[PDB]
Design an enzyme around this catalytic site. Structure first.
Site, short mmCIF file in Angstrom:
data_model
loop_
_atom_site.label_atom_id
_atom_site.label_comp_id
_atom_site.label_asym_id
_atom_site.label_seq_id
_atom_site.Cartn_x
_atom_site.Cartn_y
_atom_site.Cartn_z
N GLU A 181 0.77 -1.28 0.05
CA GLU A 181 -0.14 -0.08 0.03
C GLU A 181 0.92 1.27 0.03
O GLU A 181 0.46 2.32 0.64
CB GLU A 181 -1.11 0.14 1.16
CG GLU A 181 -2.14 -1.22 1.11
CD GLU A 181 -2.87 -1.10 2.22
OE1 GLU A 181 -3.18 -0.19 2.99
OE2 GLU A 181 -3.92 -2.19 1.94
N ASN B 78 2.56 -5.03 -2.93
CA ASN B 78 1.20 -5.34 -3.30
C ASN B 78 0.29 -3.84 -3.01
O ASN B 78 0.69 -3.30 -2.30
CB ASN B 78 0.79 -6.28 -2.05
CG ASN B 78 -0.60 -6.90 -1.87
OD1 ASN B 78 -1.20 -7.32 -2.83
ND2 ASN B 78 -1.17 -6.71 -0.80
N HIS C 263 -9.90 -5.73 -3.25
CA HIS C 263 -11.16 -5.64 -2.57
C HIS C 263 -12.12 -4.65 -3.32
O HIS C 263 -12.19 -3.58 -3.60
CB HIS C 263 -10.68 -4.98 -1.29
CG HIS C 263 -9.86 -5.51 -0.51
ND1 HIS C 263 -10.23 -6.89 0.37
CD2 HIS C 263 -8.62 -5.29 0.06
CE1 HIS C 263 -9.28 -7.14 0.89
NE2 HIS C 263 -8.40 -6.40 0.76
N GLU D 7 -6.00 -10.60 -2.42
CA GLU D 7 -7.14 -10.06 -1.03
C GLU D 7 -8.49 -10.19 -1.56
O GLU D 7 -9.20 -9.47 -0.98
CB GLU D 7 -6.70 -9.05 -0.40
CG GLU D 7 -5.08 -9.02 0.12
CD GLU D 7 -4.66 -7.71 1.02
OE1 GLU D 7 -5.69 -6.98 1.68
OE2 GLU D 7 -3.43 -7.50 1.30
N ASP E 249 -12.11 -10.09 -2.19
CA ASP E 249 -13.48 -10.18 -1.63
C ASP E 249 -14.33 -9.27 -2.44
O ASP E 249 -13.96 -8.45 -3.06
CB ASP E 249 -13.41 -10.02 -0.18
CG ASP E 249 -12.73 -8.70 0.42
OD1 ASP E 249 -12.66 -7.59 -0.38
OD2 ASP E 249 -12.37 -9.06 1.41
O1 LIG Z 1 -6.12 -4.86 16.57
C1 LIG Z 1 -5.78 -5.65 15.41
C2 LIG Z 1 -6.73 -5.05 14.32
O2 LIG Z 1 -6.49 -3.73 13.97
C3 LIG Z 1 -6.71 -6.17 13.08
S1 LIG Z 1 -8.29 -5.74 12.07
C4 LIG Z 1 -7.54 -6.33 10.35
C5 LIG Z 1 -7.26 -5.13 9.59
O3 LIG Z 1 -6.59 -5.38 8.25
C6 LIG Z 1 -7.76 -6.22 7.86
S2 LIG Z 1 -7.14 -6.49 6.04
C7 LIG Z 1 -7.39 -4.91 5.32
C8 LIG Z 1 -7.85 -5.37 3.71
O4 LIG Z 1 -8.02 -4.21 2.94
C9 LIG Z 1 -7.08 -3.33 2.76
S3 LIG Z 1 -7.34 -1.85 1.56
C10 LIG Z 1 -8.72 -1.22 2.13
C11 LIG Z 1 -9.70 -1.38 0.87
O5 LIG Z 1 -10.73 -0.37 1.16
C12 LIG Z 1 -10.21 1.13 1.24
O6 LIG Z 1 -11.08 2.05 0.86
C13 LIG Z 1 -9.71 0.89 2.62
O7 LIG Z 1 -9.36 2.20 3.38
C14 LIG Z 1 -8.53 0.20 2.71
O8 LIG Z 1 -7.79 0.20 3.68
C15 LIG Z 1 -6.69 -2.71 4.45
O9 LIG Z 1 -5.74 -1.90 4.20
C16 LIG Z 1 -6.36 -3.90 5.15
O10 LIG Z 1 -6.37 -3.22 6.58
C17 LIG Z 1 -7.78 -7.74 8.36
O11 LIG Z 1 -8.51 -8.45 7.72
C18 LIG Z 1 -8.16 -7.37 9.73
O12 LIG Z 1 -8.42 -8.60 10.47
O13 LIG Z 1 -6.78 -7.61 13.40
C19 LIG Z 1 -5.78 -7.82 14.06
C20 LIG Z 1 -5.50 -6.94 15.56
O14 LIG Z 1 -4.58 -7.48 16.39
#
Ligand SMILES: O[C@@H]1[C@@H](O)[C@H](S[C@@H]2CO[C@@H](S[C@@H]3CO[C@@H](S[C@@H]4CO[C@@H](O)[C@H](O)[C@H]4O)[C@H](O)[C@H]3O)[C@H](O)[C@H]2O)OC[C@H]1O
Length: 314
Positions: free
Chosen positions: A127, A169, A205, A233, A235
């Protein structure tokens, strides 16, 4: 084929999922994991917060659990992710200048060394780019280190692991747009100068009914730079609750994505971002959206399942 694993296996491609190792104790989750995928990535267990909670003190139990799962079931293991602005501990954010650079380099080195010979491919940088073109604007790496951090991270990953496939990625880069053009420019530059870089990940996504029509063309122009490509990733989220129309469109969308990969010889395969709607990250981030995955919250196959099987040529 009677499973998605059989379909992908038969096609000579990868079909992966994002694993939460804690869910392996739920037998239905494990049964689907075991039988429906030939590749695994850690949803969270190999991120910086999960692996280096204080400076140079590593917590590999959860990541090791994912790696052991891959080895025990004979699945390819994909590493996610060495350098990312999100899920970055405060201790790292509090560092600056050479001290921050050194923390990045040490993180890359220690995590890649730890998993060497187990992880086949890494998301070395995640990112890095901005919607609308150029570099991401809320990143500790970009803000503290500037443009050069990406090359630093790739060279450090190769120094630690001479053979792993090293990937960059991103998301919203599935179509040809300012963001994917910026990514394309970097990939072309790295290959031209011999910076280690083997692959590009397209998170995918997506929203139901909105698959880029130029996805295949875009994957192909990247492959033609001399790198592999992968959908990392996937979905496809909808307004909840699902209904027949939405599930049919979603199935068609899954088919479009898998077909775009099939149509590019260097597309390694497709990884979906989870197994079941029960655990998908989507509803927590996007209020009133969800039902984004191939299995519903009661582990029933959705119409997306048959579409994926068909697209892999089964
Ligand atoms: O405490 C933590 C807890 O923070 C995490 S929750 C974790 C977050 O990451 C996601 S993966 C997710 C997938 O999409 C990308 S891109 C995304 C797409 O839509 C846009 O408009 C958004 O603004 C973009 O961010 C993300 O960047 C990415 O964060 C996991 O699936 C969750 O599980 O879990 C662990 C705990 O310890």
């Amino acid at each position: 084929a009677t499973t998605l694993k059989e379909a992908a296996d038969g096609a000579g491609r990868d079909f992966g999922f994002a694993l939460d190792p804690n869910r392996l104790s739920e037998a239905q989750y494990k049964a689907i994991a075991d039988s429906e995928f030939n590749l695994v990535v850690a949803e969270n267990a190999m991120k910086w917060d999960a692996t280096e909670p204080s400076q140079n003190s590593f917590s590999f139990g959860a990541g090791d659990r994912v790696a052991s799962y891959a080895a025990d079931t004979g699945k390819e293991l994909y590493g996610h992710t060495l350098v990312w602005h999100s899920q970055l501990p405060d201790w790292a954010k509090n560092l600056n200048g050479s001290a921050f650079e050194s923390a990045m380099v040490n993180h890359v080195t220690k995590v890649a060394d730890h998993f060497e010979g187990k992880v086949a491919s890494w998301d070395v940088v995640n990112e890095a780019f901005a919607d609308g073109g150029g570099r991401r604007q809320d990143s500790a790496f970009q803000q503290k280190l500037g443009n050069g951090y990406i090359e630093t991270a790739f060279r450090a990953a190769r120094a630690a692991d001479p053979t792993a496939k090293l990937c960059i990625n991103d998301y919203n880069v599935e179509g040809i747009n300012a963001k994917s053009n910026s990514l394309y420019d970097l990939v072309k530059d790295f290959k031209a100068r011999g910076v280690p870089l083997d692959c590009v990940g397209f998170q995918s996504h997506l929203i139901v009914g909105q698959v880029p029509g130029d996805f295949r063309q875009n994957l192909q122009r990247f492959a033609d730079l001399g790198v592999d490509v992968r959908i990392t990733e996937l979905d496809i989220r909808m307004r909840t609750p699902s209904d027949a129309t939405k599930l049919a469109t979603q199935a068609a969308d899954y088919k479009k994505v898998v077909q775009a990969c099939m149509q590019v010889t260097r597309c390694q395969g497709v990884t979906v971002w989870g197994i079941t709607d029960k655990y998908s990250w989507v509803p927590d981030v996007f209020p009133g959206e969800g039902a984004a995955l191939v299995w519903d919250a009661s582990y029933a196959k959705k119409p997306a399942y048959a579409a994926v099987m068909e697209a892999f040529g089964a």
